[PDB]
């Protein structure tokens, strides 16, 4: 059988997804919990040119704020007591495919920045030093909070907003 989309506003949103097909600009999805955000990311990617490519979805809340900037990107050896190898990255694992960051508002100012730098340059370095890796990952942010607000609270970098705010989809409860 199939999936489920039939209400006007969604009859719509599906198409918006379909059009966005041939694209790679990041996408910002927003709706209350349960509305289908992460279901749209997944669909956007099933429809993007890189459907067959991996889908690296990671809940930004499912990781202590102090280790996100260690697992998203990666880690350069001996910089934090105990390192079995410079740590790879979800960015690197998502290289060539999609990287669906769920619950964006929960990004530390430090990573909010560090992401921005990788959304524009596409290059990143694991900790102190310089970039030595090439990643081609389409950003897909989804959050249930109101981004704009957070911007006047200073909890959310504005320039990072507009950067992910290329394509913006809003799922109605």
């Amino acid at each position: 059988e199939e999936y489920v989309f039939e209400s006007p506003k969604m009859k719509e949103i599906l198409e918006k997804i379909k059009k966005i097909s041939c694209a790679e600009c990041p996408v910002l999805i927003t709706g209350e919990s349960g509305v289908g955000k992460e279901v749209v990311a997944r669909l956007i990617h099933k429809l993007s040119d890189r459907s067959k490519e991996p889908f690296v979805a990671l809940n930004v809340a499912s990781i202590p704020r102090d280790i996100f900037e260690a697992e998203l990107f990666g880690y350069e050896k001996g910089a934090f007591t105990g390192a079995v190898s410079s740590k790879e990255g979800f960015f690197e694992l998502a290289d060539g495919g999609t990287l669906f960051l769920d619950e964006i508002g929960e990004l530390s100012l430090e990573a909010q920045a560090k992401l921005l730098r990788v959304i524009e340059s596409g290059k990143f370095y694991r900790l102190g030093g310089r970039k030595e890796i090439e990643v081609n990952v389409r950003i897909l942010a989804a959050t249930n909070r109101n981004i704009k607000e957070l911007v006047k609270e200073g909890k959310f970098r504005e320039d990072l907003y507009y950067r992910l705010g290329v394509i913006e989809i809003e799922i109605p409860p």
């Binding site: 918006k16 059009k19 966005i20 041939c22 694209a23 600009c25 507009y162 705010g165 290329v166 394509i167 913006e168």
Partner: protein, 73 residues
Amino acid sequence: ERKEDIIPLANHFLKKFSRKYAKEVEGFTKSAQELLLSYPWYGNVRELKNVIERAVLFSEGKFIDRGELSCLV
């Protein structure tokens, strides 16, 4: 504060993307051009860059008017 820039810039962009995503989009309609000039553009040049890449992709025919734009602006 450069409404004399919105329509030219926008037109720049609409060209970039129309060519970037191989879309038969030639340009904005009057009705649309108005809107673009009224929007406050907080993001300024940046926001317009996005608003239009987005409008180029969402585009269905050869032109863009209140239709796709209102979706955003």
